[PDB]
Structure formats: C-alpha cells, structure tokens
C-alpha cells in the first residue's frame, strides 16, 4: 500500500482555475474553533490513497 | 425499545431545524453520508423516517 499519493478533502471555497494551494492546515467542519486543535468539527483536509 | 425492535417514526408536514442538534456535542457520533450536515437546512425532501 503506497500512501505518498495524497491529496486535500476539504476547503472553505473552489479553486479558481491553474492555481495551486498548499495550505495544509486544520478545516473547521462547524462551529466549533479548532484553534489547532482539532476534536469536533475539526478535521485534516489532506489524505491518502 | 431493542434493537431488532426497533422504533419507526415518519415525520412530514412541519418545519424542521437540524442546527440544535448539529451544535449539540452531547452525542458521541454525529455521522452523515447522503449530502453535507452544513447544508441541511437548505435543501429538503418529501418526508423523513427515523
């Protein structure tokens, strides 16, 4: 199982056309403030293969 | 009641908020798989069974 091949679930809005976003950081799923803390309505967009 | 008694409830031909029991931490899993949680109250359907 190769997991070097990974890729970003989650983001507040699209991407605009031939561009690239490199922001790994915590996604907010609700209205809880995850304040780099992850738990409820906090989760990490970037995920394997 | 049990589980493989379980209840069946139909609800239809009301208003309906799910952001009460989307804020609500109280339950330990929270799972959604047709569409979104966040948009929930947005679209809607002819009628619900619980």
Request: proline share 4%; glycine share 6%; aromatic share 20%.
């Amino acid at each position: 199982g190769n997991y070097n091949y990974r890729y970003r679930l989650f983001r507040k809005s699209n991407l605009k056309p031939f561009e690239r976003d490199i922001s790994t950081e915590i996604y907010q799923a609700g209205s809880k403030p995850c304040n780099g803390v992850e738990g409820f309505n906090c989760y990490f967009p970037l995920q394997s293969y | 009641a049990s589980v493989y008694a379980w209840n069946r409830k139909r609800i239809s031909n009301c208003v309906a908020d799910y952001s009460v029991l989307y804020n609500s931490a109280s339950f330990s899993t929270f799972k959604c798989y047709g569409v979104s949680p966040t948009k929930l109250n947005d679209l809607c359907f002819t009628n619900v069974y619980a």
